[PDB]
């Protein structure tokens, strides 16, 4: 019922179809459409869906905290200033 060639459309630049498809796939991935399709192939029962969502939220929390710690400590990867002591 909507207009066509507006949603999920990426224009190809100078026949660079590879990059256009990469951009389209990146858009779908960032918006979460690809994972949604993959999960909608077979029905996910509500208990399984809740378990998956809880696991993914805990994973997101842990990954974000670990990334924050890594970025915080990365400055300390520099050379040893007190070598030999």
């Amino acid at each position: 019922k909507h207009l066509k060639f507006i949603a999920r459309t990426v224009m190809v630049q100078e026949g660079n179809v590879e990059s256009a498809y990469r951009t389209l796939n990146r858009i779908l991935t960032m918006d979460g459409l690809i994972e949604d399709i993959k999960h909608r192939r077979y029905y996910e029962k509500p208990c399984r869906r809740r378990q998956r969502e809880s696991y993914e939220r805990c994973r997101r929390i842990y990954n974000m905290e670990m990334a924050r710690k890594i970025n915080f400590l990365m400055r300390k990867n520099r050379a040893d200033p007190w070598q030999g002591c």
Partner: peptide, 28 residues
């Protein structure tokens, strides 16, 4: 970073748990 306040099932937390991790949420 997502909030952890009131998520896990703990004493004094009135609501039902939001997260049910199988491992402690502690950085390795």
């Amino acid at each position: 970073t997502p909030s952890l306040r009131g998520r896990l099932a703990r004493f004094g937390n009135p609501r039902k748990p939001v997260l049910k991790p199988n491992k402690p949420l502690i950085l390795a």
